[PDB]
DNA sequence: TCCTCAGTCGCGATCGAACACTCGAGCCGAGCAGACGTGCCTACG
DNA sequence: CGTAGGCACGTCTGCTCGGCTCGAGTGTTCGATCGCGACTGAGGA
């Protein structure tokens, strides 16, 4: 939301100094002259910058800062002196930074100078190349700092590389003149023997390594995984790396960004990846709800190649319909709250299917109308208004 | 490491001497520390981690000498670094100064290593992220054990 | 060790070598000009 | 008199885990030739 | 008499070569089970 708004119009400036922001058509000196979208993005950027301050100075020290502010205010709140002490209930920026420096011993003045006083987000364009001879991974990260909303980042940058030997984090120092970052790569001895490949968490899984390159061990790369800067990343992986990142990652933002990047690769391996995500309980439900729409877009792009039925129809009849009647939907029992959301989002994406003539097929429209006719809600303890409203959608 | 609280002897006091005079405290609590269970790996001699720590320590010292410099083009002297690290060959010190500095022979700043104008000197938290104090303790343990074995 | 080790004198010899080389270089410069 | 039948021993048989050997990538020190300067000393006006 | 053109060190520059570590890659050994035929007591014809 904030990178869309700041690249759209100028930027949000937390803590201006009194104009400080002249790129935008109102004055930021008073709350009653702000646009309402600017007020909303102001609150949004403020809580993300506080998450960044928690990233630099750990969460228990952050809660100690907040407790110190509240405790000064509550010793202030019981005095009777007319504001000799009632102004300890008012916080400022300098007092907040001083309380942070009191509890932690680190000051955050570079982070405050970059993300508060400066009003911009950063844009990262990354591309890699694997050097087989020296066994290194040559990243190439360049910033677009000449757009109207952007600024230049010179700090450190975390990158997480999943190779066959596991998941390794690397810190890169991205100075102004930097372009190529050579990080080292590990072995490929988990392709010699079939062993399980260890993940970002402690677990390990069986991966189908037939799509991987023979010479490179690395399975996927993520630039800034923890969202530790206010950034927009445009990484150029290979399509099998996006499919491996969709399947076997233990991070929902990486699964979402792989869904978002698989729309450019309409190959049938990506259709298999999104269909395996859709069938998979123990995936987070908002990833499967995105995979519905991604599968609809991919299915629209590979018409005159699609083999069987329309997308997600057989999957809908496998998950939510009767075993004896495929075209009759099961009676509504909405007590699971994840297959309820997936059931009410799957025909909405299924209706975006189009034939070679650019008209929605009469197999999906008939399916949606049979979902509407055979709807029986006399048996669940929950209402049907959102599911029926999504059927109209 | 497991520690065990013992009371102090009744005769022993603690004298803190400085340049100005002697100062006396009593002590009442003294722990006995058992066999340590190490959580940090001491590097070996001529290891890759050993040479990496030596290079990073020299680089951190050079950056902090550049931060301490009051001259508007930040400039340091080589024999300050040669006083700090006298066992180092000067080729290694010049390797650390090659990037981030240049030698001025003539004119102003002569016989000084001025900081390059395009080089951004790292901030305090980056210099702290370069070398950790526990790595310095592991290096000191390695070189002390090197001396005792030698 | 000293039996297998077969120096301020060597440093002086190196200084003499550098002086000779510099004189030869100056002679080369004179020949060129 | 039988009459096969259930539980277990010895040996080949392959398999996973570890261990020894190789080979190159990369860094570090020494060494050497030389330049870029300061001081220290002579033929010409 | 003055006055500008040649000799020693100091510190840095740059290239070459040899040595050391360290991890990837590949081949070799050895216990750990799996299966087969057989041993050997055992309750019913």
Swiss-Prot record, chain A:
Disulfide bonds, paired cysteine numbers: none
Expression sites by tissue: Expressed in all tissues tested.
Top-level taxon of the source organism: Eukaryota
Additional information: PubMed:9418870 was unable to show an association between TAF2 and TFIID.
Subunit description: Component of the TFIID basal transcription factor complex, composed of TATA-box-binding protein TBP, and a number of TBP-associated factors (TAFs), including TAF1, TAF2, TAF3, TAF4, TAF5, TAF6, TAF7, TAF8, TAF9, TAF10, TAF11, TAF12 and TAF13. Interacts with TAF2C1. Component of the TFTC-HAT complex.
Task of the protein: The TFIID basal transcription factor complex plays a major role in the initiation of RNA polymerase II (Pol II)-dependent transcription. TFIID recognizes and binds promoters with or without a TATA box via its subunit TBP, a TATA-box-binding protein, and promotes assembly of the pre-initiation complex (PIC). The TFIID complex consists of TBP and TBP-associated factors (TAFs), including TAF1, TAF2, TAF3, TAF4, TAF5, TAF6, TAF7, TAF8, TAF9, TAF10, TAF11, TAF12 and TAF13. TAF2 forms a promoter DNA binding subcomplex of TFIID, together with TAF7 and TAF1.
Family the UniProt entry places it in: Belongs to the TAF2 family.
Name of this protein: Transcription initiation factor TFIID subunit 2
Organism: Homo sapiens
Full-protein residues shown: 401 to 800 of 1199
Swiss-Prot record, chain B:
Coiled coil: none
Domain of life: Eukaryota
Modification comment: Phosphorylated by casein kinase II in vitro.
Protein location: Nucleus
Record note on quaternary structure: Component of the TFIID basal transcription factor complex, composed of TATA-box-binding protein TBP, and a number of TBP-associated factors (TAFs), including TAF1, TAF2, TAF3, TAF4, TAF5, TAF6, TAF7, TAF8, TAF9, TAF10, TAF11, TAF12 and TAF13. Interacts with TAF7; the interaction is direct. TAF1, when part of the TFIID complex, interacts with C-terminus of TP53.
Recorded disease: Dystonia 3, torsion, X-linked: An X-linked dystonia-parkinsonism disorder. Dystonia is defined by the presence of sustained involuntary muscle contractions, often leading to abnormal postures. DYT3 is characterized by severe progressive torsion dystonia followed by parkinsonism. It has a well-defined pathology of extensive neuronal loss and mosaic gliosis in the striatum (caudate nucleus and putamen) which appears to resemble that in Huntington disease.
Domain notes for this protein: The Bromo domain mediates interaction with histones that have acetylated lysine residues at specific positions. The second domain also recognizes and binds histones that are butyrylated and crotonylated.
Family note: Belongs to the TAF1 family.
Function in brief: The TFIID basal transcription factor complex plays a major role in the initiation of RNA polymerase II (Pol II)-dependent transcription. TFIID recognizes and binds promoters with or without a TATA box via its subunit TBP, a TATA-box-binding protein, and promotes assembly of the pre-initiation complex (PIC). The TFIID complex consists of TBP and TBP-associated factors (TAFs), including TAF1, TAF2, TAF3, TAF4, TAF5, TAF6, TAF7, TAF8, TAF9, TAF10, TAF11, TAF12 and TAF13. TAF1 is the largest component and core scaffold of the TFIID complex, involved in nucleating complex assembly.
Annotated protein name in UniProt: Transcription initiation factor TFIID subunit 1
The species this protein was found in: Homo sapiens
